[PDB]
Structure 1
Amino acid sequence: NRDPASDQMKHWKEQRAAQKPDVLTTGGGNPVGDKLNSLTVGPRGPLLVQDVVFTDEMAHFDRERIPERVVHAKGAGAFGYFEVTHDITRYSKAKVFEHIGKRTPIAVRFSTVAGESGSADTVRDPRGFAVKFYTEDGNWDLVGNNTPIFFIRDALLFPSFIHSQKRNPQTHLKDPDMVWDFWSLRPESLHQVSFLFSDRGIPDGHRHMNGYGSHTFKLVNANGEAVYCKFHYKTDQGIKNLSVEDAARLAHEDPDYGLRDLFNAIATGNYPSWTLYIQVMTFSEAEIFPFNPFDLTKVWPHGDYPLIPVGKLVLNRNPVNYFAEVEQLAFDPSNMPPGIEPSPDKMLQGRLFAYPDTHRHRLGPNYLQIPVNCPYRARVANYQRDGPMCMMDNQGGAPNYYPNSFSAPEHQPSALEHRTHFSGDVQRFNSANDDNVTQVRTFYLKVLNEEQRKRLCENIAGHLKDAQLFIQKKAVKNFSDVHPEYGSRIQALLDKYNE
């Protein structure tokens, strides 16, 4: 006997032994007489187009694939529910927080960042942790990572960052000179790079890491009052990491380690769960906050802004078909129910457009009619019509223009957005010299003990050594600008690695 994942077909058969197999048909439902031998004129003769059974099957095989995600391509998927445990209605009027005990079906997709579809799971990289809440007020997508921060704070640099993390445009190889020349030219990446090369850069699966909204969001209560918040959902299974040596063995031993881990866990009853906290920051506090409260390279410290518990995320169901239920998942940070709203964070502002845009390209214009993406607990009604692969009644004969004297849908005034005042020159403001070291200094000195610092500089050195010397010198200087010992320890290891 083996693990549950290996016995998938065995159990699909046992769960069916009481029936007769189905008739094998064509896309059009036409039963097939023989689907092992093609229609030819004579045993050793050529093929006939009269063999549509072949053309119907081959033509579909030729179109099985779709474009993989531009980032976070390698992913795992599961399904569960979110249950409310405390009361934060004073901050948010979102239906998903209405009363204690409220359950909401969720869908979750873990993922790496840079690897393509076939890459390994146990590698140094951030981890995606997108969560989709199916509320009565529409879908709420919390597209979070395993880290509360990122490498940059402007969306215009994001394509550049991804291009620097992926393959060379001529050799198609992972290029160290592309990784560090970018990081060393943008020191604001110092904070997230220190997280990434720590022990938590390679989690022991998806069940032993936290998730974070990272972005500052906005919560609105029933009175129309607003506060800024962060989202933290911590693992109830405890932080656990893989060492460089073990993570490298599993890289070729089991490229799908975290995929097999998640599936076998839920199958054997071990339902992983996460505890959803929030930090809150009033509008007044945001004005005096030392750093920019909407800078994605900054955290709200815990001592000044403690964690407030909200509810639990539980995963208790596997997918039945991976492609239909995981590959075709689409999380839009633009999907936000009343009571939740975005902050002026430049990074989140770009994500408001990027995700719906790429989905219409990767999946299709009407990707929201795919089952797992549908807001199936909300009544979708508007004046949108047509588009490729329209799957419902297309809202039937309802008037397709607004306004109209024929009682088509109506706007709901209570769903208006919070009104905030802004004044200033419409202009591209230079955010490259916002504090790039302070919070990193605290992490290096006060969060990491001595052993962890030691492993931090060995992981960085082990990867930075491949770059050219002038890139090493620039990166080390940026590490010196955090702590003189931080840099000089990296430099020491580099002096050795350079023979």
Structure 2
Amino acid sequence: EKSAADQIVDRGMRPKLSGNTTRHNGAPVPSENISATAGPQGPNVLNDIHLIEKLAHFNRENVPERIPHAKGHGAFGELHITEDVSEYTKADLFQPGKVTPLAVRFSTVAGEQGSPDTWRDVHGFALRFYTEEGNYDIVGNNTPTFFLRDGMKFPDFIHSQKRLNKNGLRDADMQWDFWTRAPESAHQVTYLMGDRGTPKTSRHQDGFGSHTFQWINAEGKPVWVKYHFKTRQGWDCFTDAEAAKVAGENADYQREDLYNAIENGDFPIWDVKVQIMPFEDAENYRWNPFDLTKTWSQKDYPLIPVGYFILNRNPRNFFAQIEQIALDPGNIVPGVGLSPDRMLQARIFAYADQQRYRIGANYRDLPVNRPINEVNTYSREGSMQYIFDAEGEPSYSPNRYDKGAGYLDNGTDSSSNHTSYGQADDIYVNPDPHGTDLVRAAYVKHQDDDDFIQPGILYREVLDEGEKERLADNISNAMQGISEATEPRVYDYWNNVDENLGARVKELYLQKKA
């Protein structure tokens, strides 16, 4: 409470009503209890209008769930800026003193809508900031990295984490068959199989933008950034056995936790920080700075504070404001840009594409998805158009009226006669493409770029002995059910991360198997 988000979360909400019910045309309902028949023991009549309306709308309550990240929950709150980063970005929401309303949705990845919150899985950490220059979404995860570096492979990964086509069962052999044949997965798989694969709540986990993004300042100068959201509640994790116990006791443990916390005034807080890499330092970093499977060392690029955000408002209506929210990494704003991360670039297409289907063509007009400023667009019509332009405004640009065109355009013509605008920094200021042809090529290879060195460093230099052993324990548990064919491939995969981890994984797996 009480709360900069109130202007957003109150949108679309009816006043409280009493007395009797009405049909959807507003006329009084005679009964919610008894349907009309032709004689007490006679047949139901076709023209019990309320009955049919009630049943027919009930029949249409469900919509396609997200793929992936179907199971989730969220809240609203406030972003507060506490440091001055104007030398790096001109983005309005990050300027000194700014307070911006936010929405957040937390989620798992693989499971469907009814599935337990505490299955071992990556957790989504997706933020919307309702800024004065548009909705800026940072659609992140509770991990600084991810399983892949090319969006072409994303549907393969997600099918491998979901259900077999023949019987609708999730499958260990399929999961490890994919992971070990796509060894770029090694970094994120090591993270996933550790303690953090099973955080207790949504409040007790960090969030990350994961990808490298770009910040552009008022002079048009760019820097590369990575977002970190550090939990003030601290990381707190279940064991593998505890996470499964909780799954059976309360499939909605984390959903209920976050709701309860906010209701109790126990508002969770994250500190907003960035790693900042100078534009010209990208090519010489020991790892490729645009490879999603590579984190930037915090020794090389320490966390730099920006502000914090707080979750202080539960949704008014879960379906309307959480299920229907359309969080999209393509929702960037002036002062923020993308990068040559191929995963990120695929995502920039993919989210709005699914949302057009899952919600509908006009999903942007729903209360939770509208920005605080008016949208000035030539888009029109489409299913369920609630909002429409002022009477008689033009439908095309360039036109002879006032509605306007792009800020690069003159508003009066098509920019013919060989007009050029130059570098598209609003997308991003690009580094060298390293070629002039359309190609299918590897990422530029940096000195320490391979699939295994980073999880190896995590194991050897970061984890304590308890974490190392639990990791081997979790892995060997997650291997139960794989085929004889897959066993040696998995042994080798873990040996590539680290030989001691590999040995312990194999030892524990064989102990546990019959």
Question: What TM-score, normalized by structure 2, do the two folds share?
Answer: 0.91
- Say whether the 8 Å CA contact 2:211–2:341 is kept in structure 1: yes
Deviations 1:351-406 (A, max 9, x none): 0000000000000001000100111x112112111111000134432111111121
Corresponding residue for residue 82 of structure 2: 85
Q: Secondary structure at the match of 2:315?
A: coil
Which one of 21, 29, 34 corresponds to residue 32 of structure 1? 29
**Separation (CA, whole Å) in 1 of partners of 2:46 and 2:482:** 57
Alignment of 1:46-445 (within 5 A): 46-100=43-97, 102-375=98-371, 377-413=372-408, 417=426, 418-420=428-430, 422-424=433-435, 425-430=437-442, 434-445=449-460
Alpha-carbon distance, 1:465 to partner: 2.9
Alpha-carbon distance, 1:275 to partner: 0.5
What letter matches 1:400 in structure 2? S
- Say whether the 8 Å CA contact 1:227–1:282 is kept in structure 2: yes
**Separation (CA, whole Å) in 1 of partners of 2:218 and 2:492:** 50
**Separation (CA, whole Å) in 1 of partners of 2:19 and 2:387:** 27
- Say whether the 8 Å CA contact 1:227–1:280 is kept in structure 2: yes
**Separation (CA, whole Å) in 1 of partners of 2:298 and 2:403:** 49
Larger deviation: 413-422 or 115-124?
A: 413-422
Alpha-carbon distance, 1:461 to partner: 0.6
Q: Secondary structure at the match of 2:485?
A: helix
- Say whether the 8 Å CA contact 1:216–1:345 is kept in structure 2: yes
Alpha-carbon distance, 1:141 to partner: 0.7
Corresponding residue for residue 412 of structure 2: none
What letter matches 2:339 in structure 1? S
**Separation (CA, whole Å) in 1 of partners of 2:32 and 2:470:** 58
What letter matches 1:466 in structure 2? G
The runs of 5 or more residues in structure 2 that have no matched partner are 1-15, 410-423
- Say whether the 8 Å CA contact 2:36–2:48 is kept in structure 1: yes
**Separation (CA, whole Å) in 2 of partners of 1:307 and 1:496:** 42
Deviations 1:319-344 (A, max 9, x none): 11110011001111111000001111
**Separation (CA, whole Å) in 2 of partners of 1:452 and 1:32:** 62
Alpha-carbon distance, 1:195 to partner: 0.5
Alpha-carbon distance, 1:246 to partner: 2.0
**Separation (CA, whole Å) in 1 of partners of 2:91 and 2:22:** 47
Corresponding residue for residue 472 of structure 2: 457
**Separation (CA, whole Å) in 1 of partners of 2:301 and 2:40:** 78
Corresponding residue for residue 4 of structure 1: none
Pair 280,201 (structure 1): closer, same or farther in 2 beyond 3 Å: same
Alpha-carbon distance, 1:144 to partner: 0.3
Alpha-carbon distance, 1:282 to partner: 1.2
Pair 244,164 (structure 1): closer, same or farther in 2 beyond 3 Å: same
- Say whether the 8 Å CA contact 1:386–1:394 is kept in structure 2: no
**Separation (CA, whole Å) in 2 of partners of 1:341 and 1:203:** 31
- Say whether the 8 Å CA contact 1:399–1:408 is kept in structure 2: yes
Deviations 1:215-254 (A, max 9, x none): 0001000001001100001101111111222222211111
Number of aligned positions between the proteins = 479
| 1:471 and 2:486 are equivalent in the alignment | yes
| 1:487 and 2:483 are equivalent in the alignment | no
Q: Which 4+ stretches in 1 moved above 3 angstroms? A: 413-416, 418-423, 430-434
- Say whether the 8 Å CA contact 1:382–1:409 is kept in structure 2: no
Alpha-carbon distance, 1:450 to partner: 1.3
- Say whether the 8 Å CA contact 1:93–1:338 is kept in structure 2: yes
Larger deviation: 462-471 or 119-128?
A: 462-471
**Separation (CA, whole Å) in 1 of partners of 2:505 and 2:377:** 58
- Say whether the 8 Å CA contact 2:134–2:373 is kept in structure 1: yes
Alpha-carbon distance, 1:416 to partner: 5.9
- Say whether the 8 Å CA contact 2:288–2:444 is kept in structure 1: no
- Say whether the 8 Å CA contact 2:232–2:271 is kept in structure 1: yes
**Separation (CA, whole Å) in 2 of partners of 1:422 and 1:200:** 36
Larger deviation: 362-371 or 477-486?
A: 477-486
Alpha-carbon distance, 1:22 to partner: 3.5
Deviations 1:47-88 (A, max 9, x none): 112211111111101101000111111101111010101011
**Separation (CA, whole Å) in 2 of partners of 1:395 and 1:384:** 13
Q: Secondary structure at the match of 2:497?
A: coil
**Separation (CA, whole Å) in 2 of partners of 1:26 and 1:47:** 19
What letter matches 2:433 in structure 1? F
- Say whether the 8 Å CA contact 2:222–2:429 is kept in structure 1: no
What letter matches 1:223 in structure 2? E
Deviations 1:248-280 (A, max 9, x none): 221111111101100110001100011000001
Larger deviation: 145-154 or 465-474?
A: 465-474
| 1:44 and 2:41 are equivalent in the alignment | yes
**Separation (CA, whole Å) in 2 of partners of 1:248 and 1:419:** 46
Corresponding residue for residue 11 of structure 1: none
Alpha-carbon distance, 1:20 to partner: 7.7
**Separation (CA, whole Å) in 1 of partners of 2:195 and 2:122:** 12
Q: CA RMSD in A?
A: 1.6
**Separation (CA, whole Å) in 1 of partners of 2:231 and 2:186:** 25
Alignment of 1:4-43 (within 5 A): 21-43=18-40
